[PDB]
């Protein structure tokens with residue numbers, strides 16, 4: 001039909017085949033459900049209208065179905081559009097040295113070529129702006145992008161080229177505040193600079209919670225949405241593709257296991273009650289700071305196999321502290337209902353519980369297929385990627401909430417360098433912790449033995465009041 005005859009032939013251009021039930025399906029601007037990578041590229045650079053939601057979602061999630069080098073190749077191929085031949089009358093005009101009318105040729109340039117080409121430059125611009133890490137990770141990808149952008153011709157295009165170049169140069173330069181005064185840094189037994197004595201009971205619990213909240217706030221803010229798409233952090237190139245997400249997970253493992261280690265390696269019962277009570281006070285200060293992540297790390301250490309079973313320890317923990325722990329536990333019950341309302345009801349700044357996003361992303365990744373099948377043809381399941389992208393969007397809404405708290409560089413380093421496992425792998429460390437729990441508090445038929453004190457300093461806490 002007339003509309004399809006004015007588009008380029010399939011023998012000269014791959015992005016103009018007619019839409020069909022076996023190359024694209026959909027759920028204002030229509031919402032793409034699934035499609036071939038070629039039909040996804042066509043709609044990413046659609047001539048009829050701009051589509052900021054699809055562009056944003058595509059560039060966050062495309063790595064789960066297309067490599068960066070392949071995407072750049074596809075948008076460059078999209079950009080090189082063949083022009084139609086002159087009409088018979090215009091061929092005669094050209095043959096006589098005269099100017100052709102070129103009525104359809106001019107219509108095709110203005111209504112299809114120029115919009116698609118600007119749509120391609122818009123993808124390039126959004127790509128360099130929001131996902132510059134693709135270019136930092138692949139210097140050759142950036143070389144290709146700059147060669148492409150640098151050889152575009154025309155005045156309306158050179159302005160787009162300049163704004164794309166401006167972002168690229170700003171991103172390269174980038175790689176090579178508090179309204180109120182922050183509260184005074186709290187000290188307890190350990191003195192500033194005496195890093196050799198830093199420990200759970202020697203540092204002030206207020207300061208432990210404040211420095212862990214700064215650390216976790218920074219780890220939470222550094223996570224980029226694409227590190228969470230397609231379970232790439234659990235796959236071969238995880239270190240390159242999910243460096244910030246892996247640091248976030250490693251910190252929670254290390255901190256959680258260090259709390260467990262602090263507890264079960266305190267073999268004396270009265271000393272272990274002081275350790276458990278101190279971790280609960282740390283949790284209370286995380287609650288005051290709206291560090292839900294920290295609260296649920298403490299809940300996770302208290303609920304772990306080696307700690308949860310310590311009946312004699314928890315028996316000496318005051319009811320008030322047991323009630324705080326129970327209420328913190330109940331943040332997680334009923335698919336995190338209390339937590340979700342508390343996250344929305346509190347005033348910023350805060351650190352959301354990161355684990356819930358990973359759980360929801362993994363359920364979406366496992367619960368939906370990679371492709372949809374329509375008339376024997378496989379189509380990329382794009383709605384699956386959009387659902388994952390919507391969860392990463394929830395992560396991003398809390399990533400601009402800095403804390404009015406002073407960094408204590410030695411305490412920061414102390415928590416950044418937690419290494420409870422040492423040369424052990426996680427399984428043999430958790431097996432060791434559990435066996436240590438059986439040693440300090442044997443199962444009921446066996447009696448409770450006594451163990452000598454390991455701490456020379458006082459056990460009384462300075463409390464959670466500044």
Ligand SMILES: COc1cc2ncnc(N[C@H](C)c3ccccc3)c2cc1OC
Pocket residue numbers: 299302303308314322325326327328329330
């Ligand atoms: C049925 O399983 C549970 C129910 C719980 N209900 C309430 N609080 C819990 N944990 C908090 C952190 C806590 C409270 C006091 C002492 C030790 C830990 C629960 C933990 C559970 O199992 C892992």
